Subunit: 319 residues, 3 copies
């Protein structure tokens, strides 16, 4: 009865593995998603000399209107009131002992301005070639050991995610609407305790991504909040819930270069254009929503059955 | 002749259903899309006291450069010239009858600043704990019954969408280039009259999404403009046109919380940093482009035929 | 031996074409990607009268924090210190010889403000209807023949792209980490010389997209940098590298309208709100990352084999 043994193996594969395990009787379908991230949290910096400085959702969220891939500022370097005048160059670009060593015109590489050919003093001692550009130039030589926005670990990230599968015309929201009047705005996400709460503490998000928040709070980083949908639409639609997973992107063996984009707050004072050059060492959260809806379709079901007869056929022939 | 009857059912399924109906002889392929949204429209607000205030594409579009998921401001609450000084707190955060009820330091939850421990008067009567923060604090207690930007319903949304299917190396534009010199910039999209015109009135977009514009114009909302491509590349490439569909995202039983992001216009006056805190109740339009190109490929065609022989086989065996 | 000849053709198709050529023994899977674009480059404009004007990564990148679809400003038209007062209208909107020809209220189409009904002089000769709006109005009548930011062709676009295939739990970075201490920051991308260097010169990107940079530098354009991943995860993960391809989106027979979005730099002077209306003729780079990981899966392998037996079956029956 070797045929029966061979046929049983084929029958197990078609039913147990393809259908029961691999869900081969359903047509997988992707989703188009819309993510609305809402942040709550205020961070004070206690900056010496200047004093405390608060930062609300309008100031530490890039873009302000929110996006799938947004940035939460955790640290920054500010150059107050930059103007396009004549000043020294940063030593990293170049140094000079006399005006004869300063080549007129913009530098070939690492250019910070129009080198006028004059050697002026960036430091009390170090003298760098005068350049036409944003003055004073961005020093960017020290990163505050305690992150200026260190409180951002307590910031709550409310993610309002709406997905839809065009093939099956099924629309789902990351809010399962099981909340009650008292439970309203009284949950924080946890991988075990509250897997369905869409409110994420940033410190918890970074921690569950394998990255220490204090390391990312200073130099910046990128965290991928993958909202994974695995709707088995053969069942009821309420049984499909998002599975939030956090990944440390650009880890580089858990030593990331740190997300350190630069943005300016342009303003005009006394009729002269100025700007506030912020080198923001923020944590960029990317809501990489992925989905695979498995709904019973007669095409994969019957092709597998036909495949099975082919699988069963070839097998018994060989034996 | 029961075999012929069973075989006919299988033959109908393979040809009529899989091939003719389900297009099982073609390899479905997704697309990578690029969306360039152009808006035309000016909205006046006729704000009492201040007077009229115009809002052009530079001011009511977030982001300004445009994106797949952008926001069109339909209403806003403005806090003019916020400064990081010492003032009262919003009553929602907390209230106080005396300085002894104000806990020094930042509040555990619903924190709006650094509570100095002093109880000062937010209202003529209500007294809230003094907090270091953006002053004056955002009241956010009244929403203009007529939306400040109510004219946005007449705003035209010109969507320049370029898609491409990497598998088939076919590039398509939502502009079928059937326009003529006179027809240029003389069409508005309609689900029946002009299904191919890429210029969408925002009032029409919201209306066709099942949401009343006046409701969304005040508190904000999210509208999903799904540009659906269903190219049957077996035919000519000109026969593939976008199918624009509008969906009300986060409807919550047609009672949305309203998209109400906050952004600031930072500026410096008299050497002091200020900002204009706008709580924008805009309508966020997400251009969720989805595509499935069906081009004749020998792999799905012959696997179905092989599946068919398996389907036909198993059937006649059972009978 | 016609059967053997027919069987050989089927056997070649199943193995040679489906498996060896079309990789029909592997389950294709898409990827969720995160793109971090870093730009280096300073552009001077040598604007007559005003003088030189520098533009760094903080000023010519939209959005500042970076995104998959970002804009690099190559040209702009600036309207300094626009205010919401009473001034003339642009002639394109309308003209007038007397106040009786100016209809009070906002214009039905091409409206630039609240027409007060008075006919004032936009030009020394041309007289247009006074409108309440941003004053002075955007002329937008001349485009600098040499692009103000023409140096942007030398700008280096460092693209830090992290992808991941959720089905196979494989994370990849566009950085293959073959760099050495000396090679660090010493490469530029080339289609042949350096196919793996993630640093792209913008002039090279536009040139390889089939578009002349000088044409796009003036009126703007859209360039699609498709980072294509084709991981054959059956092999080692190091053998999968990104394939960068540049496409000219919205070419319109290689005559693009030019990406010409508008953004404003709002500021307050003397207690009055102003803005700097920039019509940016930038080049919008869209990082359209696409991926198809082929990893050996028993489902496509055995269904093809079963399909084959069906293919082989039907064939020999016909003959
Ligand atoms: C001299 O310039 C360098 C720039 O790298 C800076 O780090 C250093 O602090 C300066 N020295 C002093 C005494 O300020
Ligand atoms: C008192 O404060 C509340 C804050 O909720 C505000 O709504 C109300 O208008 C204030 N009362 C007066 C008389 O201004
Ligand atoms: C008159 O206005 C038009 C607006 O289209 C402008 O192009 C032209 O230069 C103006 N004439 C003068 C002499 O400024």
């Amino acid at each position: 009865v070797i045929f029966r043994l061979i046929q049983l193996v084929v029958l197990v594969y078609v039913i147990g593995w393809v259908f029961l395990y691999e869900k081969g009787y359903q047509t997988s379908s992707g989703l188009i998603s819309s993510v609305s991230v809402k942040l709550k949290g205020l961070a004070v910096t206690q900056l010496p000399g200047l004093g405390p400085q608060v930062w609300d959702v309008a100031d530490y969220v890039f873009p302000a209107q929110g996006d799938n891939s947004f940035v939460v500022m955790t640290n920054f370097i500010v150059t107050p009131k930059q103007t396009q005048g004549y000043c020294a160059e940063h030593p990293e670009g170049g140094i000079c002992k006399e005006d004869s060593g300063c080549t007129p015109g913009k530098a070939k590489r690492k250019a910070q301005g129009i080198r006028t050919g004059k050697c002026v003093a960036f430091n009390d001692t170090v003298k760098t070639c005068e350049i036409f550009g944003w003055c004073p130039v961005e020093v960017d030589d020290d990163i505050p050991r305690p992150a200026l926005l260190r409180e951002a670990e307590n910031f709550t990230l409310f993610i309002k995610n709406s997905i839809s599968f065009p093939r099956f015309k099924v629309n789902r929201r990351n809010l399962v609407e099981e909340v009650n009047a008292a439970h309203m705005k009284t949950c924080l996400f946890h991988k075990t305790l509250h897997p369905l709460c869409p409110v994420f503490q940033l410190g918890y998000v970074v921690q569950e991504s394998g990255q220490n928040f204090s390391t990312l709070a200073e130099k910046g980083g990128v965290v991928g909040i993958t909202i994974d949908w695995h709707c088995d639409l053969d069942w009821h639609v309420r049984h499909c819930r998002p599975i939030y997973e956090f990944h440390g992107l650009y880890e580089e063996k858990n030593l990331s270069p740190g997300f350190n984009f630069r943005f300016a707050r342009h303003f005009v004072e006394n009729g002269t254009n100025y700007r506030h050059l912020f080198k923001v060492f923020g944590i960029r959260f990317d809501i990489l929503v992925d989905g695979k809806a498995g709904k019973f379709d007669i095409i994969p079901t019957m092709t597998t059955i036909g495949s099975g007869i082919g699988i069963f056929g070839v097998a018994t022939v060989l034996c």
